């Protein structure tokens, strides 16, 4: 775990802070983890509530927090997860998927997206202007 990594996690944990003392409410730990780029499941979050023991008031101190990020950060690998999630709609062996295939996928899995937001991104990814998309490339362009 990098020293740089703790700097941002200290900063994130300053806010959400109740009593302004160093206690973070249990339920919000879920929220804070989701902001810091890790998506733990409904069950996996209960692991951190038990694995780091919980006995009522407080007990979710800052040291407990970056322990889980460490744990959770290890067993999850985000860029391959997104690549994996775009290959299922590959069906053709080749890296590209149809722009219509993409649009359909982005509508369904973008819950708080708008039609124009989805239209704009299908144009941006369609560099070639043919109606095919490099799914990796498209990821590449929304990682900037």
């Amino acid at each position: 775990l990098t020293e740089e990594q703790i700097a941002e996690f200290k900063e994130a944990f300053s806010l959400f802070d109740k009593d302004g003392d160093g206690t973070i409410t249990t339920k919000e730990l879920g929220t804070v983890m989701r902001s810091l780029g890790q998506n733990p499941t409904e069950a996996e979050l209960q692991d951190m509530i038990n694995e780091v023991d919980a006995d009522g008031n407080g007990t979710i101190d800052f040291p407990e927090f970056l322990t889980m990020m460490a744990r959770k950060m290890k067993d999850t690998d985000s860029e391959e997860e997104i690549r994996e999630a775009f290959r299922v709609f590959d069906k053709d062996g080749n890296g590209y998927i149809s722009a219509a295939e993409l649009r359909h996928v982005m509508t369904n899995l973008g819950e708080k997206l708008t039609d124009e937001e989805v239209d704009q991104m299908i144009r941006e990814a369609d560099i070639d202007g043919d109606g095919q998309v490099n799914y990796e490339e498209f990821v590449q362009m929304m990682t900037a």
Binding site: K10, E11, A12, S14, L15, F16, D17, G20, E28, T31, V32, R34, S35, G37, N39, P40, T41, E42, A43, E44, S78, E81, I82, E84, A85, F86, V88, S98, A99, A100, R103, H104, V105, M106, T107, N108, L109, G110, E111, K112, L113, T114, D115, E117, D119, I122, D126, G131, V139, M142, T143
Partner: protein, 404 residues
């Protein structure tokens, strides 16, 4: 006509999803996921199916006119085998004129529900006596218009199946074409039923979403569009077993497709993965072509992409706010941000990504909903302020949060 209204709504959506492709035109609109396969037919043979159909119609216990039977079957059969949009609607319009209602029975007190699983009835029962508001959940089965359309479709499918020879497979291609066409019917009509959803909608899919099923292909799109119009609230997914949702309040029943944990499943369609899985599972028992294989892919990962790609997309998902860049400053509404009330956030550097994440985190910590927010928020000089009658500096940054 009310179904011609819905139909028109659906034809747009299909044409919106087809914009890159532009394979849609007048009369032909492509149902998403329902490839059009049309192959050559002997013309008179159509009449064989036509008169079978017509007979079937009026020698069955259905609310159709006596002599209308010839008319109906002619319309239906042409409409199906030709992929003609106007005829598909006309057939639907006609049916609606025989006292077939294409709308849910408890017009406003019904929760339009979706079932795309196994034992809907069990789920439905728990769901029905869970609502504390006199609300009763409704499936596509409950719609008399839907059901009767499916009945006739079933009959033409069966004609093909048990009048044709697979042996001679130039005949198989005619079977595959008729199967393909009747498949897009069930597909179109599920988009009709789905454009009628309001408020909170329930979706039964045990074992997660099933890619390439009706929900994913035609229902979920129609439900998405309704949300961006503000007509539908939460789409609640019951992908766990029925017990887990037992003795739970109606609000708390189900989660979202995009949440972590929800599984995805396919019918084990791939050229070589069938075989990989075959010698790695012809070990115990085996696999039938329709056996659902649990993938290890995360739909949540696509949602995660958006959170780290679009600014304040997390306030949307987690707090149902819509932060847009305005004349100068971000304007904030309740999502989808077509409704009146408008609040503002000013940053001292509106393009810095560190800055957006900070005010983002701040808002998730202090406000549970939009209505709790002050009329103006400022992230300036490592301070956050707010103006709501009187200005206050709620927190300062010197490596941390010094509230006050």
């Amino acid at each position: 006509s009310l179904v011609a209204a819905r139909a028109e709504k659906v034809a747009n959506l299909y044409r919106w999803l087809d914009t890159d492709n532009d394979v849609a035109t007048d009369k032909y609109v492509p149902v998403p996921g329902f490839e059009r396969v049309d192959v050559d037919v002997s013309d008179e043979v159509k009449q064989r199916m036509i008169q079978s159909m017509s007979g079937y119609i009026e020698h069955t216990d259905n609310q159709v006119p006596k002599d209308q039977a010839e008319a109906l079957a002619t319309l239906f059969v042409e409409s199906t085998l030709d992929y003609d949009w106007d005829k598909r609607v006309e057939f639907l319009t006609k049916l609606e004129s025989y006292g077939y209602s294409f709308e849910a029975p408890h017009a406003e007190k019904s929760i339009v529900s979706f079932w795309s699983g196994k034992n809907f009835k069990q789920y439905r029962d728990i769901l029905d006596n869970a609502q504390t508001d006199g609300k009763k959940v409704v499936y596509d089965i409950d719609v008399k218009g839907n059901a009767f359309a499916i009945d006739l479709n079933k009959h033409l499918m069966r004609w093909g199946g048990l009048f044709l020879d697979p042996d001679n497979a130039e005949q198989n291609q005619l079977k595959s074409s008729i199967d393909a066409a009747t498949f897009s019917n069930t597909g179109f009509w599920s988009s009709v039923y789905a454009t009628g959803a309001q408020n909170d909608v329930y979706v039964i899919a045990e074992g997660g979403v099933r890619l390439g099923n009706y929900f994913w292909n035609v229902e979920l799109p129609a439900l998405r569009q309704l949300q961006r119009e503000g007509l539908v609230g939460e789409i609640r997914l019951l992908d766990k077993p029925v017990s887990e949702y037992k003795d739970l309040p109606a609000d708390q029943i189900g989660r979202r497709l995009t949440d972590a944990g929800v599984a995805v499943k396919v019918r084990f369609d791939a050229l070589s993965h069938e075989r990989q899985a075959e010698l790695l599972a012809d070990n115990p028992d085996g696999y039938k072509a329709d056996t659902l294989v649990e993938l290890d892919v995360k739909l949540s990962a696509i949602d995660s992409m958006l959170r780290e790609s679009l600014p304040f997309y997390s306030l949307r998902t987690e707090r149902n706010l819509l932060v847009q860049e305005g004349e100068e400053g971000f304007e904030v509404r309740s999502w989808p941000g077509i409704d009146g009330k408008s609040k503002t956030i000013l940053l001292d550097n509106p393009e810095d990504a560190a800055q957006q994440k900070s005010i983002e985190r701040f808002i998730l910590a202090n406000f549970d909903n939009f209505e709790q927010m002050p009329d103006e928020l400022f992230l300036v000089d490592n301070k956050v302020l707010s103006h709501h009658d009187g200005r206050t500096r709620i927190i300062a940054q010197k490596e941390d949060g010094a509230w006050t």
